[model samples]
Target: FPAPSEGLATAKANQGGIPKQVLSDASWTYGEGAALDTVAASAPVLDIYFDYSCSHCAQFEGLHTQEINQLLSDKKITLALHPCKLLQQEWTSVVMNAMGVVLDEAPAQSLSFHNAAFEIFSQAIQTKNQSNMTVEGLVAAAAKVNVPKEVSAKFKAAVDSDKYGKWVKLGDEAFKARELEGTPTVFFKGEKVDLNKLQTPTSLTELVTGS
Candidate 1:
């Protein structure tokens, strides 16, 4: 369970350009992934837009990552789209660049690094100040997870190589195209989903079964 400090409200005081009404579509598509089409083919592909610095996003990750991993292990494809919001601008890019480096240098450990990065950012919600979302702080957090210094250096280089810029542009394009309102938004099969109504695993299971 997350600490008390992490139990903040998830309400948005200001509604952005995104529509409040939930989308009710069955078939939708997005960016390319190894199992993107397969996932969308079998079940509702869930596109998750999250901010690394949001406490609610951390809570959702803690609840969802394991289920998604298990489903993937069972040959179920789940499309996850993570977008960097204003709160997570700096650290999310750093971590993505690090993951890209891991994918290039140590393919075997790429998943490990990705999972560790998730934990680092999620735990940082309660442990570290949100203001510490800089590259330096992210690197320090990665080091705590035993990511090699050389790997971290290479990751930093990748971040500086315009790779993260490309990803940011892609995410921005997705946000603009989908008209996403805020962090922790989930689009299931090309339609908006009300996370509040599907807060539990059973609720999510119901959505999948119905789809």
Candidate 2:
């Protein structure tokens, strides 16, 4: 991964003086509470910004989550942001809220919810079956992990909470600030990544380690 100075400078330079409003609205929040920055301080972050219903997003998830998980277990930090768009806003919100609830209510189960959600979206994207992208569909998928109906309902409600609007806004700001090229964009500690540099799982690990 790029050193901190290089990463931050590259992110700033690529930002290219866009209008401040377009780059970042005043509504964004930052804290451990937000998923975007939740990780071990010393671990280098492999930050991904994706949309649950986007086909390319699904491809990346299917191709990378497990590899990324193993890498994280080996000391990498992966912070993912699931943003909503025209096609998947409703379901995306449900999934995000579900994640927030799981992270907040049962920290130990957070990884299960995260992995299950990833699997659900990967399947939905690959099959072109939008049904698996809905609240009911998500609940069904979560059931495999023993995420109960009541818990799912509560998580769904949390996802629908007004606070989500702020989260969406934050994602929009981040996207614009970085002039994101498209879905499934990855950043190594905030620097834009050229997927061609390390397309495979092992190669990605090497890139992140700057080895």
Candidate 3:
């Protein structure tokens, strides 16, 4: 398990705007920034709006997870994830709650958990066997990514206790507050990106590098 970081104890709405989650490392930004905190400003910002239970979102994750990781590894862009509940399924809230746990408690494992959550959903969709999407199974995404047992235990406990229920609702509110069109939305440098125009992994990297 990675070292634990500060938790999301102060997230709240800002005069009807989105609530932002800032990491101390400044590598990833989640949600929108209010006046109190500093968002990642130096690198190009890639704001990715996706829903955990959406199939299109899963496909997008599959296509670009590697490239996204590469960009982060290279410090080319700061990733802002908007894990919305556009689908409004219980699963979306459940998964986002798990994301909340990892983001708050296990910052280093957050990215791994993020990709694994989509992979779990993607597999279920592919097999047409969503019966595997139980609470136990969904939390198991952390374990699949080799998250430590203690962290995974926290994930399950948080999900069970609804520890981040308010946070999850804030995320949905942020989604609507932004008037985003749908899941799998991509914004590069504060401008909406045409997903159709991106034909390869390098396309996203190129978009940020302008090469």
Candidate 4:
């Protein structure tokens, strides 16, 4: 059994279909920045492995983000983020490394930044060939999400200096080792989401609610 007071605290919102449980007792202000590595093993978990480069990943995430909001609001499952590379020698590789930095330093804003980063990925479809996602570009992109300038700067350093490169490498190897293909691979309660039928609201709600 998992210990009490682990991972994100159980929190709830009024708009839920299936009721969510509070995972922890703390609120944001009193909350120590979330330490994801400490997530309880016994808790129901939805692990989402992703890379920021794939437009298809963005597409899938865009659809899921809506449903995920309610799941999070309900605290129905713990969300675990894993960053890996699908595109080598691309801006996304840098972004992937920087992802770790922000998760560690700006835990409070990490989710907001991640959602905003997905927005950047979707926006990239228009300018991908002409301009790839750059360190400065990501820094500016994160700033809009209210990430503190210092944290953003450290994130840039982590990416530019390749401080988190090895972390990304390990994540990538584990992704392939598990024989998982591509970004946006999602697993909840140890069951993988079926990609072909994963894009719709009805399908997604069913995944979480069994309704």
Best-to-worst ranking by lDDT: 3, 4, 2, 1
lDDT digits (tens) for residues 1-211 of candidate 2: 1222233222211122221211132111111122445454456556566765566766666666676767766656544443544354666656665654554455455556666777877776557776766666667766777765666666556555533455455555555665656777777776767866655657667776677
lDDT of 3: 0.68
| Candidate 1 local lDDT, 110-179, one digit each (tens) | 4455556667667666676555455565566556666667766766566677464554554555455555
Off by over 4 Å in 3: 1-42
Q: For residues 3-79, what per-residue lDDT tens digits would candidate 3 score against the true structure? A: 11211212333322121343321123633333333333345668777888899889889888998888877666767
Measured by TM-score, how close is model 2 to the native structure? 0.67
* Per-model TM values vs. the true structure: 0.63, 0.67, 0.79, 0.73
Q: How many pairs of residues collide in model 2?
A: 1
- Select the stronger candidate by lDDT from 1 and 4: 4
- Where model 4 places Cα greater than 4 Å from the true spot, the runs are 1-43, 127-132
Ranking by TM-score: 3, 4, 2, 1
lDDT: the better of candidates 3 and 4: 3
lDDT of each: 0.54, 0.55, 0.68, 0.60
Question: Candidate 4, overall lDDT?
Answer: 0.60
Candidate scoring better on lDDT of 1 and 2: 2
Q: How accurate is candidate 1 locally (lDDT)?
A: 0.54
Per-residue lDDT of 6 in model 1: 19
Error of 4 at 168 (Å): 0.9
